[PDB]
Design a binder for this molecule. Structure first.
Ligand code: HEM
Ligand code: NA
Length: 153
C-alpha cells in the first residue's frame, strides 16, 4: 500500500480540491472529455456537447464532476481501507454504466494533470508520486470487484 507520508501528501492536496470542489470537478471532466472524447459518450445527460465553452456552461456537467470528486475524496480519506466506499461504486460502474478500467486510467491522469496545474505548491514530485499510487490502488481494487460482478473492464 502507501506509507503514512504518502497518504498525508494525498490528503494535503485533496484539501485544496475540497476548498472548491465544483471548480475542480469541471476542470477534471473537461480535461478528460477533451483528451479522450469517447469517454463523453458515457454521459447521456451531456454527451451532445462539443466545445469547452459548452462544457463550462453545463450545470449537469458541473454537478456530475462534484459527485465524482466528492466520492473519490471519501475513498482517499480511508487511506486504503475503502471496502464500504468502493463496493457501491464498483457495482454501478459495472452494471448501470459500464466504465472500462482504461477510462478510470484516463480520469486518474486528468486528476493528476489538473492538480499539477492548479496546485503546484501542494503537488510537487513526491506528492504526485503518492497521488499516482493512491489512484492505482483505487483502479486495481475496482478491477478486482468488476471481475466478481461479471464485467470484463
Ligand atoms: C475517480 C473516478 C470516479 C469516481 C469516484 C466516480 C464516482 C461516481 C459517483 C459517486 C457517481 C454517482 C453515483 C453512482 O452511480 O455510483 C458516478 C456517476 C457516473 N459516473 Fe462515475 N466515477 C468515476 C469515474 C468515471 C468515469 C471515468 C466515467 C466515464 C468515462 C464515469 C461515468 C459515470 C456516469 C455515466 C455516471 C452517471 C452520471 C449521471 O447521473 O448522469 N465515472 N460516478
Ligand atoms: Na495500512
Amino acid at each position: 500500500g502507501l506509507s503514512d507520508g504518502e497518504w498525508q501528501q494525498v490528503l494535503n492536496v485533496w484539501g485544496k480540491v475540497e476548498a472548491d470542489i465544483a471548480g475542480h470537478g469541471q476542470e477534471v471532466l473537461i480535461r478528460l472529455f477533451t483528451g479522450h472524447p469517447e469517454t463523453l459518450e458515457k454521459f447521456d445527460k451531456f454527451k451532445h456537447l462539443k466545445t469547452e465553452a459548452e462544457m463550462k456552461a453545463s450545470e449537469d456537467l458541473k454537478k456530475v464532476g462534484t459527485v465524482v470528486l466528492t466520492a473519490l475524496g471519501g475513498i482517499l480519506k480511508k487511506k486504503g481501507h475503502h471496502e464500504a466506499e468502493l463496493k457501491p461504486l464498483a457495482q454501478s460502474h459495472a452494471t448501470k454504466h459500464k466504465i472500462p478500467i482504461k477510462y478510470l486510467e484516463f480520469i486518474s491522469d486528468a486528476i493528476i494533470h489538473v492538480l499539477h496545474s492548479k496546485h503546484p505548491g501542494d503537488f510537487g514530485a513526491d506528492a504526485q508520486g503518492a497521488m499516482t499510487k493512491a489512484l492505482e490502488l483505487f483502479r486495481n481494487d475496482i478491477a478486482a470487484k468488476y471481475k466478481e460482478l461479471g464485467f470484463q473492464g
